[PDB]
Design a binder for this molecule. Structure first.
Ligand SMILES: *[C@@H]1O[C@H](CO)[C@@H](O[C@@H]2O[C@H](CO)[C@@H](O[C@@H]3O[C@H](CO[C@H]4O[C@H](CO)[C@@H](O)[C@H](O)[C@@H]4O)[C@@H](O)[C@H](O[C@H]4O[C@H](CO)[C@@H](O)[C@H](O)[C@@H]4O)[C@@H]3O)[C@H](O)[C@H]2NC(C)=O)[C@H](O)[C@H]1NC(C)=O
Ligand SMILES: *[C@@H]1O[C@H](CO)[C@@H](O[C@@H]2O[C@H](CO)[C@@H](O[C@@H]3O[C@H](CO[C@H]4O[C@H](CO)[C@@H](O)[C@H](O)[C@@H]4O)[C@@H](O)[C@H](O[C@H]4O[C@H](CO)[C@@H](O)[C@H](O)[C@@H]4O)[C@@H]3O)[C@H](O)[C@H]2NC(C)=O)[C@H](O)[C@H]1NC(C)=O
Ligand SMILES: *[C@@H]1O[C@H](CO)[C@@H](O[C@@H]2O[C@H](CO)[C@@H](O[C@@H]3O[C@H](CO)[C@@H](O)[C@H](O)[C@@H]3O)[C@H](O)[C@H]2NC(C)=O)[C@H](O)[C@H]1NC(C)=O
Ligand SMILES: *[C@@H]1O[C@H](CO)[C@@H](O[C@@H]2O[C@H](CO)[C@@H](O)[C@H](O)[C@H]2NC(C)=O)[C@H](O)[C@H]1NC(C)=O
Ligand SMILES: *[C@@H]1O[C@H](CO)[C@@H](O)[C@H](O)[C@H]1NC(C)=O
Ligand SMILES: *[C@@H]1O[C@H](CO)[C@@H](O)[C@H](O)[C@H]1NC(C)=O
Ligand SMILES: *[C@@H]1O[C@H](CO)[C@@H](O)[C@H](O)[C@H]1NC(C)=O
Ligand SMILES: *[C@@H]1O[C@H](CO)[C@@H](O)[C@H](O)[C@H]1NC(C)=O
Ligand SMILES: *[C@@H]1O[C@H](CO)[C@@H](O)[C@H](O)[C@H]1NC(C)=O
Ligand SMILES: *[C@@H]1O[C@H](CO)[C@@H](O)[C@H](O)[C@H]1NC(C)=O
Ligand SMILES: *[C@@H]1O[C@H](CO)[C@@H](O)[C@H](O)[C@H]1NC(C)=O
Ligand SMILES: *[C@@H]1O[C@H](CO)[C@@H](O)[C@H](O)[C@H]1NC(C)=O
Ligand SMILES: *[C@@H]1O[C@H](CO)[C@@H](O)[C@H](O)[C@H]1NC(C)=O
Ligand SMILES: *[C@@H]1O[C@H](CO)[C@@H](O)[C@H](O)[C@H]1NC(C)=O
Ligand SMILES: *[C@@H]1O[C@H](CO)[C@@H](O)[C@H](O)[C@H]1NC(C)=O
Ligand SMILES: *[C@@H]1O[C@H](CO)[C@@H](O)[C@H](O)[C@H]1NC(C)=O
Ligand SMILES: *[C@@H]1O[C@H](CO)[C@@H](O)[C@H](O)[C@H]1NC(C)=O
Ligand SMILES: *[C@@H]1O[C@H](CO)[C@@H](O)[C@H](O)[C@H]1NC(C)=O
Ligand SMILES: *[C@@H]1O[C@H](CO)[C@@H](O)[C@H](O)[C@H]1NC(C)=O
Ligand SMILES: *[C@@H]1O[C@H](CO)[C@@H](O)[C@H](O)[C@H]1NC(C)=O
Lengths: 120, 410, 429, 121, 426, 120
């Protein structure tokens, strides 16, 4: 069920990503406004994943290294013994930094792809 | 050797204020056009606050808005702001009804602009004010009076508030929850369950009962500016009636414009009243007091706050509760009631409604499921809805997040 | 070579869209512009601007008319007020300039009950009444309903900002000498316009932007005498306006929740409303305007300024609204010179207002209690030119679009179209 | 720095495309819904085209459709180094629909060819 | 053995659907509404099932027409000052006796200082309660239609929203229901004129090969039969009197338009139908009716039954004027140079059987002449042995639109689907 | 040429997916509702293809095997015989079963890729 994994640890809750994604787009003027806004939220999250090179994926790996100053916590203290609700507080002030780094890395990677396809 | 890994569909949320929608000739049945699932969340602790809850504010706004849309397309009774010629109602009338009803005659318009008619009708004392035997309707001073359309039902039916996609409603299931602070028994729901938009003062009717004990709740206990909402453990059954067998007359006042006037009472004339069992009421207060001790007659304002405002059968009652709250702690009780036809709802002053008369005799039985105390009080309305919505909060779902993993792209 | 597709390409097309209003967080604009409120220089962009065809002006004009009408729509009508009035002169401690300006009128009007009537009285300005057959009726009773403006509603202009919707951008011209139309070689992109106050006036434009280096003369066609000249000053001229009479407001019930706000008795002496313009400042101001006009009309041309001619006191006067009161001031004391301590302009006051040259609607402006003082900045002028060695200029006005063109001339709306192709040496495999 | 590169040549302006992409969604009654609905529709139409051409998820997409000298008879050294994107857009404005049609045809054939190889060569 | 699920998007399939269609077209009411400007694909091997009696496009059109009518009448003069007693006498000034008693000269007290005014009214709009009142002053307010608003029908087209398509049946014999084997996809309908009429359908489409008789459950007498002709019958209608208008001021910028004096003589309104054309047309209808009722069954046409003027007569809007014509001269024969149909004129109009609303149709200056095409008939069966009596009738406007919107169906496109293939590993 | 292939067999119709797809998104309150619905329907189908790992493709192959119970037919009796309208009716009762399997398969595939990248 939706949010069923909310109290589970991060490494367990990561297995219900389809459940959560599946119900985000689909669960007088104000009803119309509610629908338009739900679409806008959906698209902003999808655009952002596309910019980072994660279009079409629920789990994606990038080339931005984890900077330990963002969390100062090791493995098995994050993917276990912790839930996503808590993790979302542990790094709440580094979100914009990470997002900017993700956008920069993807732009550099696309340029490198374009050159390899011309050079080879 | 950790890398940023991006996840989408992460089960997290933030508190949020969004618009909820309603789901199910009644006004709410017509409005709540959407037809009508609970998921337990193990190990989720959440903070609730019934005194800071946008769901209550939206319900209040929706009720006012619906009411206005309902009255908008109805007869506007401005032809009645004339001097009325009024005498007392007599003949088979009891001692308790003397001066309660008046028989008013007046010069009214007709369907043609060049014709006039003389008509008469009965009014309750509360609706008619002197200005000799010359009277006017009480609101032919500050605003127009709109006649409610007789076909329209304002009977409360249960309605459900439902979240839009991207949002969820979290429900607090803890027993003995006092409207604030952490809740450890939490579940996610699609909608708020069936909440009946019952409008009343002092006594809350047809609400939810507490599971085990009477629950005392307030925004700031030991303040004096706040009301105490008491949720009862058991219901108290209250039997109300308007015993007079009445009739109606339809008067045409324009091109298809009808006014519904109170006709002669065709039976005997008696006073409206409400009954409760005496022991049930005494036990109920004893339980409330037992709980008040764990923490340690109405007066002031108009009938709308000093009496028990009550809608029964579509009629508007103003009942005297001094018979219920007259005891210091340390077969039945009868409450006399007044009836009023010109109603100014929700403390608004620019609007007024004329409640058409109802034929025959009105009887209803209601459940007292809670009290508003301050010594009875209330009349705020938002506080009535807080008694059903105290267990719900709306949260925004936030699907993206990042975390360190050992997975590198390529 | 191969086709390569690029998304996020920095290109645009001219476009017309709906802009939204934002503001700096019972005023009409404050209520409407609920969205609360940077600039990016575009190096080497040389875009073409055209003030006289700028769609942002039409949008602003429409928004003003619409809000005004929505604001008055729910207010009490004065239909029951137009009855024959019995009027006499106000002669108590009145000066000479004011004789015949004010009248004390009594009449039979309705009450909250259908069967009752009351005798009431009020004061009116001469310009608001029509003599019949002494007996009077209000101007416009037989042509339109008169709507009373709600006394709680404020029409005070506040700065407002126009902002582009997503997918659009506003380009701004920073050329200090830009004359409305043509290429601009100094362009930047903004999200919102600067704060523009929707001030309504004729002849003299109040509380706008100033030119930065010199007085700028702008016209669609400077040689076409059928078109107006918008003159933007490089310094302001301060004008001090007042309505010195200490007035009162008399509330009359006309129906069940319906009130009329009548002009009550005047306390103290009765004097004429007026505006003061510094004399030396005005003279220097015109000298600068003249130098810039010579650049278009000849350095040996005689330039004359003269006052307005035909039209009603809507256009022949300097109309403005301050303190909630409507003034129609005489500017012949300003536009009176030939080019080779203070000026006092007398003012008229009206309560029945016909906005935006419409004839089927009218507004009644409730009286303002006490005394009104306004200090405004003259930031620009609207001049017209008479149709062989002498040119004559006169004050213009009436068409509000020309006031809004004085602020919305630096802005252009474009649509962003971030998708295109170009040849490269890469091949998809 | 939205449109900051406008006026710069294509070889410089082709970089930093994230800036003009991330600012396309991030913006009365009916009139405001119309403004919002339109922004969504315009966004989706451009994404739909990238998808149907096989460029989904990319800001820079190489294709397999040859460039024609008819569309623009110019060298790369006088396009990427000398022209701005505004100028380029004008230079080939009459070949846009031709190119887009070719891109759709190419992608359709490519998907069929991939399916045939996934099915045991 | 080795089959895998393959997912395909852009699959050419659909489902029946009910959606909102928008209007499009090439001071007219439909011209300003159908502001969107105005493409057929034959489907080679598609059989589809159509049903004109359950077609949602008909209900959508009905709703849109009512809405536009009511919306165009909102910003207009509300004629409440006229619900006063009238003192009327008969007009005898150069009447040709067909019209005797039809026109009255009404004097009344206008209370907007009071003034005495005069106007002419048609008999049908006045209640003899002298001492007369206008019809409907006891039931509803009467709104004067704005003189600048044109209600002349123009072709309009209904167009599918994105994600939807309209399928069109091209069979020549299509009987209104069942499978159609010539189906094409269109973006919009052919152009339908929203003509309002009773008994006879004017200015519609013609059948291409033969008269087609379409009805739901034809053996059921309580059903309308829609007969689509393959050739039109031209009908010439006129209002011969030369009218003028009298403008009566009733407020601060508001006027009532009253019928003024008639210039010249007063004659009755009428319609002309050629006898030969009508006789051949009616004979074709009989030939086809016998296919359902029997080769030796006698068919008799009879005129309308009782009921409201709006359904017992042939109602139509001609030049903006409202006519109620007597069709007993057409439907009167037994099957084993011109026909003149007398017409009445009415100014207070109650449309679509509603009684809570009324419209005053301003008088029209000059003389009115219309040339219209009869393209179909609406017949009913009279409740027998060997004789089948048919009568003209039916007042439900939906049936005037079912006659054009019978070839169209709305379908929802469902582009996603799956099928077995031999591929694996994406 | 929208729906031109509607009466053709599946084998031919699969070659016209672009004409159908490009005409699905485009071409008073009710007009906005019509526009919002067109967008919501479009996005629901795109989300579903994405959740199944097919974003950006008109044709995608998956790893869910075909069940002989869903359709007991040979490929030559389907692709060279039936139209898509007929096919849609024949297997309509298995729609949710197949969709559920497609979501499970993609979730497992993403996890396996993440583990491989971390391992390599
Ligand atoms: C707390 O909750 C209780 C219910 O648990 C509410 O009390 C009920 O209120 C409703 C509405 O006021 C009452 O419904 C009315 O009953 C009248 C009498 O019913 C008899 O006749 C019907 C005939 O069909 C029988 O089915 C029924 O069993 C009884 O024998 C009806 O006459 C009323 O009808 C009205 O509408 C029709 C519409 O066509 C009109 O023709 C009628 O003239 C009339 O206007 C209506 O149905 C119900 O009876 C009450 N229950 C009890 C136990 O009395 C409380 O009101 C609620 N508390 C608060 C504060 O709201
Ligand atoms: C079935 O379809 C037919 C058409 O195929 C309809 O018949 C037409 O109906 C319209 C409206 O009733 C008629 O229009 C009127 O024609 C008058 C005659 O003018 C003729 O001569 C002038 C000479 O200069 C020409 O310019 C003109 O085109 C004509 O040939 C005009 O005088 C009328 O003008 C008045 O109304 C218009 C309305 O917009 C105003 O703008 C004018 O100022 C003025 O007040 C008007 O134009 C048309 O003539 C009819 N055609 C025929 C052949 O008779 C049927 O009505 C329709 N059936 C049904 C039931 O709807
Ligand atoms: C041009 O801008 C000036 C301000 O720079 C405007 O003048 C200001 O107008 C407001 C509203 O009339 C004055 O405020 C009022 O003060 C009284 C004081 O008793 C108060 O009761 C009112 O509620 C209100 O707050 C303000 O004082 C005044 N400024 C000055 C210097 O006097 C001017 O009106 C603008 N010009 C035009 C034509 O709009
Ligand atoms: C509005 O119309 C009325 C008439 O309906 C005008 O009043 C008349 O004016 C003439 C000439 O002054 C007098 O001889 C009449 O006796 C007046 N009639 C009444 C009833 O008093 C009125 O003047 C018009 N309104 C305006 C502003 O002029
Ligand atoms: C809740 O916590 C317990 C341990 O106290 C754990 O066994 C259980 O799996 C957790 N519930 C969920 C949904 O993860
Ligand atoms: C973010 O900043 C606030 C500043 O008050 C601080 O309290 C909070 O702990 C910080 N969060 C993180 C993740 O460091
Ligand atoms: C009649 O009405 C007056 C005023 O309400 C009251 O004082 C008087 O007692 C009444 N008389 C009767 C018989 O009720
Ligand atoms: C109606 O008006 C007449 C006017 O003479 C008055 O005598 C009568 O008393 C009035 N009637 C009523 C009931 O107000
Ligand atoms: C209240 O109790 C009295 C007896 O004291 C009884 O006559 C009356 O009918 C009761 N009222 C109701 C509503 O049952
Ligand atoms: C009660 O009211 C009904 C209403 O129809 C009436 O028929 C009946 O006679 C009345 N009974 C009385 C006054 O006892
Ligand atoms: C209310 O009515 C019910 C009907 O069964 C009755 O049993 C109960 O005693 C009544 N209550 C009171 C207080 O009269
Ligand atoms: C009243 O005003 C008129 C305006 O022309 C003037 O002529 C007249 O003398 C004034 N009367 C008095 C008493 O001042
Ligand atoms: C009010 O009406 C009376 C009617 O006799 C008239 O004498 C009086 O002059 C009128 N008053 C005014 C101010 O018009
Ligand atoms: C595309 O390039 C080929 C190269 O042989 C040429 O023949 C063809 O004409 C070009 N296309 C156009 C439209 O000129
Ligand atoms: C309609 O179907 C017939 C066969 O019944 C065929 O001969 C004719 O050509 C078809 N017409 C169209 C328009 O496809
Ligand atoms: C014609 O329509 C009627 C409708 O009731 C239907 O029963 C009949 O079968 C149809 N005829 C054909 C040939 O489909
Ligand atoms: C057709 O009409 C007959 C009566 O003539 C009736 O018995 C039959 O049920 C009707 N068929 C349908 C499909 O309605
Ligand atoms: C109708 O008028 C046309 C000319 O407009 C004429 O040719 C035709 O014969 C007339 N028809 C009848 C029945 O008179
Ligand atoms: C239609 O079916 C026939 C066989 O009956 C076939 O030859 C023809 O190619 C099909 N047409 C299309 C467009 O698939
Ligand atoms: C789906 O199930 C229904 C019974 O619920 C059956 O009638 C129908 O034929 C089945 N469809 C398919 C494709 O098997």
């Amino acid at each position: 069920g939706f949010l069923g994994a909310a109290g589970s640890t991060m490494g367990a809750a990561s297995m219900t990503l389809t459940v959560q994604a599946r119900n985000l787009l689909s669960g007088g003027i104000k009803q119309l406004q509610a629908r338009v806004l739900a679409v806008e939220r959906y698209l902003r999250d999808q655009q952002l994943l596309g910019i980072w090179g994660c279009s079409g994926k629920l789990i994606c790996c990038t080339n931005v290294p984890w900077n330990s100053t963002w969390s100062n916590r090791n493995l098995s203290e994050i993917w276990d013994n912790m839930t996503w609700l808590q993790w979302d507080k542990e790094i709440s002030n580094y979100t914009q930094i990470i997002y900017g780094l993700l956008e920069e890395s993807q732009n550099q990677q696309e340029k490198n792809e374009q050159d390899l396809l011309a050079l080879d | 050797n950790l890398w940023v890994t991006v996840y989408y569909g992460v089960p997290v949320w933030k508190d949020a204020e969004t618009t909820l929608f309603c789901a199910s000739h009644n006004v709410w049945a017509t409005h709540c056009c959407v037809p009508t699932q609970e998921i337990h969340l193990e190990n989720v602790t959440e903070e609730f606050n019934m005194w800071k809850n946008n769901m209550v504010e939206q319900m209040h706004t929706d009720i006012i808005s619906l009411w206005d849309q309902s009255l908008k397309p109805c007869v506007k009774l401005t032809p009645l702001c004339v001097t009325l010629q009024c005498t007392n109602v007599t003949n088979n009338i009891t001692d308790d009804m003397r001066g309660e009803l008046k028989n008013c005659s007046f010069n009214m318009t007709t369907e043609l602009r060049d014709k006039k008619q003389k008509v008469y009708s009965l009014f309750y004392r509360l609706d008619v004010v002197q200005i000799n035997k010359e009277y006017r309707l009480i609101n032919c001073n500050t605003s127009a009076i709109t006649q409610a359309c007789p076909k329209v039902s304002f009977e409360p039916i249960p309605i459900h508030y439902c979240a839009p996609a991207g949002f969820a409603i979290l429900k607090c299931k803890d027993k003995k929850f006092n409207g604030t602070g952490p809740c450890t028994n939490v579940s996610t729901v699609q909608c708020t369950h069936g909440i009946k938009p019952v409008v009343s003062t002092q006594l809350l009717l047809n609400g939810s009962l507490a599971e085990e004990e009477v629950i005392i709740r307030s925004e700031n206990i030991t303040n004096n500016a706040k009301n105490i909402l008491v949720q009862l453990n058991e219901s108290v059954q209250i039997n109300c009636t308007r015993p007079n067998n009445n009739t109606r007359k339809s008067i045409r006042i324009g091109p298809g414009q009808w006014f519904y006037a109170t006709g002669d009472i065709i039976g005997d004339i008696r006073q409206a009243h409400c009954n409760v069992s005496k022991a049930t009421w005494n036990e109920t207060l004893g339980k409330v007091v037992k709980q008040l001790r764990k923490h340690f007659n109405s007066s002031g304002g108009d009938l709308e706050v000093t009496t028990h405002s009550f809608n029964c059968g579509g009629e508007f009652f103003y009942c005297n509760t001094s018979g219920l709250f007259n005891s210091t702690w340390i077969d039945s009780i009868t409450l006399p009631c007044r009836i009023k036809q010109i109603i100014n709802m929700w403390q608004r002053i620019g609007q007024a409604m004329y409640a058409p008369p109802i034929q025959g005799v009105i009887r209803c039985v209601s459940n007292i499921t809670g009290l508003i105390l301050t010594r009875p009080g209330g009349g705020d309305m938002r506080d009535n809805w807080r008694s059903e919505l105290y267990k719900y909060k709306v949260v925004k779902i936030e699907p993206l997040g990042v975390a360190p993993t050992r997975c590198k792209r390529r």
